[PDB]
Ligand SMILES: CC[C@H](NC(=O)c1cc[nH]n1)C(=O)O
């Protein structure tokens with residue numbers, strides 16, 4: 001059908017307030033993880049994570065506007081505005097019906113819900129903000145962005161935990177391929193660092209508790225890994241039909257050539273040991289892209305630093321790629337960023353596109369002692385300049401919900 | 411490409427614990443709205459809504475399983491199990507990779523969040539349930555259903571307020587048409603009747619406050635309407651590729667021939683007065699279906715009983731359908747069910763399919779005094795037996811996010 005290319009990108013991450021600042025940090029192997037300052041966690045088993053430092057919402061919205069919206073929505077609008085600016089696209093009466101939005105979130109407005117809950121229990125239902133529902137529901141990034149830029153195309157929001165940003169980009173690409181849109185702003189945002197978030201993941205024993213060295217906590221495939229690090233932020237891409245992009249002389253970063261999905265149908269928080277669902281998902285993406293496994297050069301892994309997850313992903317890549325599994329480079333940027341949950345797939349799509357632009361595999365930092373069977377090129381410690389024609393981005397979410405995107409040099 | 415048909419349906423609604431019980435109530439013009447019993451609302455301006463009466467989760471899950479899951483997930487699994495049973499489909503190693511799930515929710519596990527919030531504020535983070543995250547996140551209907559039935563196909567969740575169930579069914583149909591699945595279980599569930607829900611919508615002044623006559627509160631296009639009625643429940647459909655359905659001699663209820671989307675890009679909680687976005691959305695659906703407006707016989711309206719919303723929908727239908735707007739029948743089943751939010755589009759898809767099966771337009775009850783310009787066949791008061799070849803279902807959600815499904819007799 002129609003070809004889909006990336007013409008714009010935007011991001012808020014624990015490493016930077018835009019794409020170039022974040023990417024510089026990635027190629028330098030810098031950690032974005034620090035003790036959390038914005039709340040007292042002295043009573044929690046995990047007291048660190050990946051915060052956006054120095055976010056100024058006034059750069060994007062008025063203070064009245066902003067004060068109605070949970071931070072996840074603010075982060076999502078920031079990444080979305082950056083990406084549209086970056087594309088150089090001009091929204092007119094001639095194209096506004098052909099431009100949609102698919103910005104998702106894993107948990108949404110947990111901070112707002114928590115603060116309205118306080119008011120409700122202390123002071124009863126009349127203390128709840130009139131803006132509580134519209135400022136908290138996950139689809140209000142899509143809603144607010146469409147209103148602010150006059151975007152009248154397909155308008156929706158995915159919520160698939162770690163897979164959110166990957167689903168959001170894949171399904172936006174489907175809309176453009178199908179003819180439902182010529183442009184889509186797609187990605188995700190997350191800000192789940194509130195009591196209920198840290199407490200909730202902590203009560204599941206899902207989080208690293210390495211409070212003494214937060215920068216060493218996220219260590220994907222390392223034998224001393226002890227759970228993921230919770231991080232905040234946002235990613236947005238401008239996806240565009242190829243002839244549309246060429247016609248306005250847009251700068252094309254890369255092509256989005258494949259999108260795959262699968263379900264494990266195994267467990268809610270644990271993968272099959274052999275990562276069978278992840279293998280089906282990657283194969284589905286490669287088949288959608290018309291690619292053979294041997295054509296893959298770089299994988300931006302799910303690699304969240306969990307005991308069961310990290311090794312299941314190695315098993316899946318070995319199953320899919322056979323002997324080529326030792327030729328390709330695979331890295332987890334979560335070594336540096338931690339796990340941005342609903343934003344993870346968006347920021348990792350951007351890192352996959354920039355790997356193609358800069359011909360460099362970002363490192364897996366903290367990979368001091370690779371665990372049994374973790375004997376691939378995991379780009380340990382330092383970035384590796386190398387040939388990259390094809391980059392995959394994997395997301396394996398709670399519920400066993402899997403998604404894989406395939407990018408290619410244009 | 412490939413044709414998509416409905417072979418199974420399931421539902422929990424304020425009118426019944428399955429499809430036939432709910433549908434009987436619809437054709438009889440019965441109200442599902444009553445004073446809310448499960449919590450004390452003596453301090454709220456709205457004290458009524460559409461509850462599921464006599465839900466027995468043990469019919470579907472073990473009590474240990476159930477006790478880990480927010481009610482929205484229980485309602486979603488109930489409708490999903492009913493629909494798969496209803497389809498007669500047998501899941502095997504030969505097809506489990508070709509069967510996915512797209513079950514969405516508007517608000518998700520607000521009840522669980524509220525009850526974990528209580529524990530957090532009273533007793534600090536260690537009182538939070540270990541199952542808080544996996545039992546509360548919107549994608550766990552898709553997750554749990556896939557695990558319970560061994561479904562390994564595309565696995566995801568939409569969250570688009572009133573449009574959730576419509577997006578969920580439309581995008582599942584896209585997956586089957588595209589070749590990503592041969593079967594999808596799609597729909598939505600909602601249980602937002604907790605303090606934060608009623609308080610939240612009340613603080614926005616969004617809800618009817620007709621506490622003295624709850625059964626008369628939901629009165630779409632009536633001049634004395636004063637906001638929507640909050641309702642709970644679930645809808646699921648089994649969508650299936652036509653040759654797949656025929657090959658196993660499945661009973662085919664109807665064909666899903668069109669899916670349209672648009673954004674208003676106007677306001678978060680108010681439509682354009684002329685319903686321009688709703689008009690684009692309906693036209694997109696008809697174009698996707700290869701249908702002319704004159705071929706539409708029945709519209710299952712959004713029609714939530716709001717001042718600005720109900721008349722904007724009339725304006726949109728008059729714009730799209732011209733003189734044929736006076737020939738077609740349009741009704742709001744929310745007159746009877748109230749607004750099930752993330753489940754609204756799923757249960758209204760089922761009512762649209764049953765309108766085709768039974769050749770009957772469900773009524774708009776409580777339409778005593780149609781407002782200025784509301785001069786269409788709104789099937790006031792009583793069901794109207796009539797010829798229905800083509801049925802549309804409209805959903806217009808917070809954020810100005812619009813979706814329309816087009817069903818046709820097979
Ligand atoms: C089930 C969700 C998630 N899944 C994975 O990590 C994974 C690894 C290989 N296949 N799936 C998790 O284990 O946290």
Ligand SMILES: CC[C@H](NC(=O)c1cc[nH]n1)C(=O)O
Pocket residue numbers: 674677678679680681682685686687688712716718719720722723726806807808809810811
């Ligand atoms: C904006 C959401 C929703 N929209 C509508 O009712 C509507 C009616 C015609 N076009 N849109 C609402 O007004 O509550």
